Write a protein that binds this ligand. Structure first.
Ligand code: 620
Length: 342
């Protein structure tokens, strides 16, 4: 029969042998395995998404994006295993490079040197430059979505919430629900934005940088609106100029109802930090999204001077472009995964 793991079938042979459990998840099970072809250990995730239209959609979205991206700092798909017919296809197995750890697990346990912080940040921005150049927003950047191997190469993963940028359709009402991870949400999400512009990823990168400096999340809101008050407590009350950019009255009047708060200077929160890192942090964590630095300007910042090399920071060859019943989604997943057969 097929090899089994923790009371579940993991039908990936013959190429992939000698499995070990390494993780459950709400999306499915991850095992490591021996690739008998390349003679390396890989990671394999088993997904069973076809009973739910929502999992089908996220699965298909991420497959199409990762198959089209090719970049050293973005996780790739090595292989996809599934049944030879649509009728027999109940599960899909995705094969990726095995990564040692992620930035979330690293920060819980390790102090980072300024050299590591700088190198990690450079790789995040280098990968983000390629992503944005393709007109895609990640929208859920956080430490657990940044994987690392044993030599500190970093790869961005988890494109399940990614969208094509759509700035003309970004506006929305006060307190509109959002799905990405609370601590790393840009303030405009809670006020007037659907998160369809590149500036929301830069905010999340600024949060990750702050978290690398201190080993703890800088804005750990308990709930939707607590998140905003954590932000203003450090950045201070927005200026009149920045309020004038918020035209929705509910959002503007909420901010006007709050007590005045002054900015807390970064160097008081992070006394050990490199002052160039704090200058870049300041420009990433700007309240007003139109004043927030873009990814190419961040790469050119003096903090990153020993790595910056635009001729070695590739952009995508063409911008990326894409209500369906699950039956059609299943058919679409079948079609996209065909190139890995037999
Ligand atoms: N790559 C890696 N190393 N350790 N863990 N880990 N990855 C989590 C993971 C492993 C293997 C395949 C994975 O892919 C999930 C995915 C789901 C849907 C579409 C495309 C890919 C994820």
């Amino acid at each position: 029969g097929p090899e089994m793991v923790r009371g579940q079938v993991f039908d990936v042979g013959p190429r992939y042998t000698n499995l070990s459990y390494i993780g459950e998840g709400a999306y499915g099970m991850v095992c490591s395995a021996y690739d008998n072809l390349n003679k390396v250990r890989v990671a394999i995730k088993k997904i069973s998404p076809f009973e739910h239209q929502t999992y089908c959609q996220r699965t298909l979205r991420e497959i199409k994006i990762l198959l089209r991206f090719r970049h050293e700092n973005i996780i790739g798909i090595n292989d996809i295993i599934r049944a030879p017919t649509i009728e027999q296809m109940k599960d899909v197995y995705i094969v990726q490079d095995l990564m040692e750890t992620d930035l979330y697990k690293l920060l819980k346990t390790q102090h980072l040197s300024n050299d590591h912080i700088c190198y990690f940040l450079y790789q995040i921005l280098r990968g983000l430059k390629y992503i944005h150049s393709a007109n895609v927003l990640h929208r859920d950047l956080k430490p657990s979505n940044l994987l690392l191997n044993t030599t500190c190469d970093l790869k961005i993963c988890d494109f399940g919430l990614a969208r094509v940028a759509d700035p003309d359709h970004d506006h929305t009402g006060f307190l509109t629900e959002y799905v990405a991870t609370r601590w790393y949400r840009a303030p405009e999400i809670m006020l007037n934005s659907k998160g369809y512009t590149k500036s929301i990823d830069i905010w999340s990168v600024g949060c990750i940088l702050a978290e690398m400096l201190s080993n703890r999340p800088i804005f750990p809101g308990k709930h939707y609106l607590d998140q905003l008050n954590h932000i203003l407590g450090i950045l201070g009350s927005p200026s009149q100029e920045d309020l004038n950019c918020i035209i929705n009255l509910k959002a503007r009047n909420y901010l006007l109802s709050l007590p005045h708060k002054n900015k807390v200077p970064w160097n008081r929160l992070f006394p050990n930090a490199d002052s160039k890192a704090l200058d870049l942090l300041d420009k990433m964590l700007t309240f007003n999204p139109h004043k927030r630095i873009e990814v190419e300007q961040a790469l050119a910042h003096p903090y990153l001077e020993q790595y910056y090399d635009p001729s070695d920071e590739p952009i995508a060859e063409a911008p990326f472009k894409f209500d369906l019943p699950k039956e059609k989604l299943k058919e679409l997943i079948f079609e996209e995964t065909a190139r890995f057969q037999p």
